[PDB]
Structure 1
Amino acid sequence: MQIQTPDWVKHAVFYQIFPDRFARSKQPRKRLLQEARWEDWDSMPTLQGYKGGDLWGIMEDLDYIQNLGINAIYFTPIFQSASNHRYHTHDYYQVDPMLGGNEAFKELLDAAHQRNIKVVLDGVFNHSSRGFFFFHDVLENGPHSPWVNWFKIEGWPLSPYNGEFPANYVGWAGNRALPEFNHDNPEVREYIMEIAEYWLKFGIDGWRLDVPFEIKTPGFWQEFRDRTKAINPEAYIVGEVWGDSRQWLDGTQFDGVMNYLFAGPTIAFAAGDRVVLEQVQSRDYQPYPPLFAAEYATKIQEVLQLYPWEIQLTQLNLLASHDTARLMTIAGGDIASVELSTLLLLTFPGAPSIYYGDEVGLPGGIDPDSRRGFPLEANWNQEIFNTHRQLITIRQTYPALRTGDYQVLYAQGQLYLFARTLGTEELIIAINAGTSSATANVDVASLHTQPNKLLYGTAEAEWNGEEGTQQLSLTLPARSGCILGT
């Protein structure tokens, strides 16, 4: 049948958050031991003064979030794991008892929902942790464990914690702290499908699929989509696949991916040489080498004619992630690069994703730590913030920028002009990557109207001419962008 994808995804702006570093709620909070005397409280140091952020924090700062204009939050992993290994799941059926509750998370959901803000969670199903119950059993019962056929065991004896031995079991990427599941095993596919159903029933609006391309068992993700959509047909299934994702985007598996194929070129064009190159997560995307308008267009037109349009409309566009360096940093502090990128990001077909912190001045190293991931402390970057908040209002104002088509009008030198059009609403977006005020004459025979009014980026160039096969000429300051409408 027709390929379908959640229609709310198609009009959402996403905000990716890292719970442990985003926000910490006000003091009155029973952290690990709920049923605890407030008189004995100080007796327990861990709970007395806990630093890192929690789910109360996020919930306590929904005002901010909803004010930026974002209407769907999706985190990293928040399920119980090692204090600082969120990705080494210990228990999938419990939100971690430091940063969060199964009681806390519940309040965050409810809260979010009464504001029409969806919430997607990160599912890590390719591998768990040494602590994960069934693996634990194996470690404790060696050859006799009932679920030895649940993992990838080479031989015995295993050596889970001792480095200078073989552990005879496959990790994620040859790691012994990330025991890989044996997805071929029916029992396993089942246990996983249930975790997905459990949280959907709990009330989440979708799953973020982590390294989903590792799970190669045939028929897996189709089932994942059936059992999921069955519980909530409006659930969002996003895969965190790096490159070409056509394998999963045929309409019977994921609704979309985190579109790094869009992140690479956009930054390569908008920042060019300015890209630090040291913060480049070369694994995830290729923001390099620098691109010219003509090249950017070819690459984007390619990316665009890659997936069924229904899915392109529910693709998660981005420029940063927990896995990558922050935007402000990858551009070496170049505010221009930061405003030009976003502009493309918020005017591209699909769901735009904003990594918490980027809507303000906040930098972010690639390497482990980081950091700093409390947005607010202010001393914000008000301008880049206003750029973010302004562009988001606009995108939510003109439907074309969400589900209109994408047509390249001009793309020469360092100047790029495309058009988003839905119905009789046509918009012209122009980016001037160059350092010299640029100007271009374009034969706009495609359009049926004449976008004359500056939404956003303050052109001086415009002139716009007759209606016999119309005739346009733009002039934008160096390193500027703009949106033309009306």
Structure 2
Amino acid sequence: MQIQTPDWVKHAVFYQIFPDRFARSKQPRKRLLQEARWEDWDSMPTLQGYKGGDLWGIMEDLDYIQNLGINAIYFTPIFQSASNHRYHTHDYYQVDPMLGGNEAFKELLDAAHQRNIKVVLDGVFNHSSRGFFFFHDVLENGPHSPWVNWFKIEGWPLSPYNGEFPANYVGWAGNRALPEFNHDNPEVREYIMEIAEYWLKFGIDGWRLDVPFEIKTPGFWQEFRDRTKAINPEAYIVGEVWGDSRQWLDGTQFDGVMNYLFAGPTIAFAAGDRVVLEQVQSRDYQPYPPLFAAEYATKIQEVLQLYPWEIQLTQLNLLASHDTARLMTIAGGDIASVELSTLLLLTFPGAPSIYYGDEVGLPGGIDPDSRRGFPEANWNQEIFNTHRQLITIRQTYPALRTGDYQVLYAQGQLYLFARTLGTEELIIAINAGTSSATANVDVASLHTQPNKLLYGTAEAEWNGEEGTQQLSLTLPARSGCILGT
């Protein structure tokens, strides 16, 4: 049973979207009352002047997305839930009406696919909301309810909304809004597995798993993988696990996780002291303290020799997420830190992921509604071009996607590694220092001699003999470059 992971993931460029705040469509939209008179429309305020984003919008902006060069988008939760509480699932079998429901989602899906762009959804199965039917039945029937043993019910009576009282049931992180499921209970296991299957049949391209480490019922995720893969052998399973994910990466559970273990160090190194350290994020990743090329190298090599390589190729690398401060903001505004990080991210083994906004420099606070961006131009044309250029490159050269990863130099604030697939070899260098740097590396590992600047505009590109290759590289302060040919 050799380990296998979706090959399309291995060459994909992900784009994480927050649909409620990404884009609202143009032409009139029968948001909720689909069958409503365009005459009585002015009579219905809520629908007539709806504000936040919908799937319509996203679908309409598919041009922009694809132009950036991202071939797969993956959202937060989009199933039916109360406003700005998308994680308090109310109904898993419906897309939220305010987003356009199943009808709109269906159109986005089809639209994205004709363009050959995948779509992954965020599954929240550790807990739901008070309105979730079965919980409701329990709240409406107390002890006499048929599904009391579907949740983690402490005692009675329950105070789901009051506060000054106990609710005698377990809520995610001690909250009475996220009633936790009793995953041990096989019936629950079944209901969930069916939700996964339903959407896969619906035609979605895989699952993101919210806080999948909270669900510890043995055998769970393996079944989740079988029942999922059964429906679609090329479906992508990604757990949002911040930290050592070896428990779920033996090849029988997830295809990979959102690699925060790559995010922290990269920023620790790429931004170092510049890291704001209020926008952390310090449940999620450790982008501190600042690292030097040698510390980053040892840290990165630790990360890379941690999971089976097939999984490493289907890891979802990132620098920002809905749960964290945007990139431009976490770097105190330093463009350099943004260009250098993205450079490492887009040249790292695994699937790179961009948080909508970062390709444009859009800033993002940590909490709350210090966010927002429907991400009006209203950009940072510099950093955007970095993003689009780097993505083309990663799509132009195969070694950057599935090549190997070998550190060549790592001293002071200068870091050089090589991505190599077959005879195609590339050298990537990062000057995280403020002073123009220069390194003489013994590149005896390579079989060729990358001497063309595919990106980065660096100097000291002097090589030499062939018996035993020798290289001298000089890069401007706070810069990076890709060498090829």
- What TM-score results when the alignment is normalised by the length of structure 1? 0.99
Deviation (angstroms), 1:83: 1.0
Q: Distance in 2 between matches of 1:369 and 1:27?
A: 27
Alpha-carbon displacement from aligned partner over 1:26-73 (angstroms, at most 9, x marks no partner): 131100000000000010000010000000000000000000000000
Q: Distance in 2 between matches of 1:248 and 1:368?
A: 32
- Contact residue 32 and residue 100 of structure 2 kept, 8 A: no
- Contact residue 403 and residue 422 of structure 1 kept, 8 A: yes
What secondary structure is seen at the aligned counterpart in 2 of 1:103? helix
Deviation (angstroms), 1:460: 1.4
Q: Distance in 1 between matches of 2:417 and 2:268?
A: 17
Q: Distance in 1 between matches of 2:59 and 2:411?
A: 46
Deviation (angstroms), 1:84: 1.3
Q: How does 1:327-476 map onto structure 2 within 5 Å?
A: 327-375=327-375, 377-476=376-475
- Contact residue 78 and residue 100 of structure 1 kept, 8 A: no
Q: Distance in 1 between matches of 2:272 and 2:200?
A: 42
What secondary structure is seen at the aligned counterpart in 1 of 2:352? strand
Percent identity (aligned): 100
Q: Distance in 1 between matches of 2:101 and 2:217?
A: 33
Larger deviation, residues 366-375 vs 429-438: 366-375
Deviation (angstroms), 1:380: 1.2
What secondary structure is seen at the aligned counterpart in 2 of 1:333? coil
- Contact residue 151 and residue 180 of structure 1 kept, 8 A: yes
- What TM-score results when the alignment is normalised by the length of structure 2? 1.00
Deviation (angstroms), 1:427: 0.3
Deviation (angstroms), 1:373: 2.4
What secondary structure is seen at the aligned counterpart in 1 of 2:218? coil
Q: Distance in 1 between matches of 2:468 and 2:250?
A: 39
Deviation (angstroms), 1:466: 1.4
Q: Distance in 1 between matches of 2:264 and 2:13?
A: 20
Deviation (angstroms), 1:372: 1.0
- Count of residue pairs the alignment pairs up: 485
Larger deviation, residues 404-413 vs 27-36: 27-36
Q: Distance in 2 between matches of 1:161 and 1:469?
A: 73
Deviation (angstroms), 1:379: 2.6
Q: Distance in 1 between matches of 2:256 and 2:464?
A: 41
- Contact residue 459 and residue 476 of structure 1 kept, 8 A: yes
What secondary structure is seen at the aligned counterpart in 2 of 1:363? coil
Q: Give RMSD over aligned pairs.
A: 0.5
Structure 1 consecutive aligned stretches of length 4 or more whose deviation exceeds 4 Å: none
Any stretches of 5+ residues in structure 2 without a counterpart? none
Larger deviation, residues 26-35 vs 12-21: 26-35
Q: Distance in 2 between matches of 1:370 and 1:98?
A: 22
- Contact residue 259 and residue 315 of structure 2 kept, 8 A: yes
Q: Distance in 1 between matches of 2:226 and 2:211?
A: 20
Q: Distance in 2 between matches of 1:363 and 1:57?
A: 21
Deviation (angstroms), 1:465: 1.1
Deviation (angstroms), 1:461: 1.9
Alpha-carbon displacement from aligned partner over 1:398-435 (angstroms, at most 9, x marks no partner): 00000000000000000000000000000000000000
Deviation (angstroms), 1:462: 1.1
Alpha-carbon displacement from aligned partner over 1:343-373 (angstroms, at most 9, x marks no partner): 0000000000000000002000001213112
Q: Distance in 1 between matches of 2:320 and 2:460?
A: 32
Q: Distance in 1 between matches of 2:214 and 2:339?
A: 35
Alpha-carbon displacement from aligned partner over 1:121-162 (angstroms, at most 9, x marks no partner): 000000000000000000000000000000000000000000
- Contact residue 55 and residue 100 of structure 1 kept, 8 A: yes
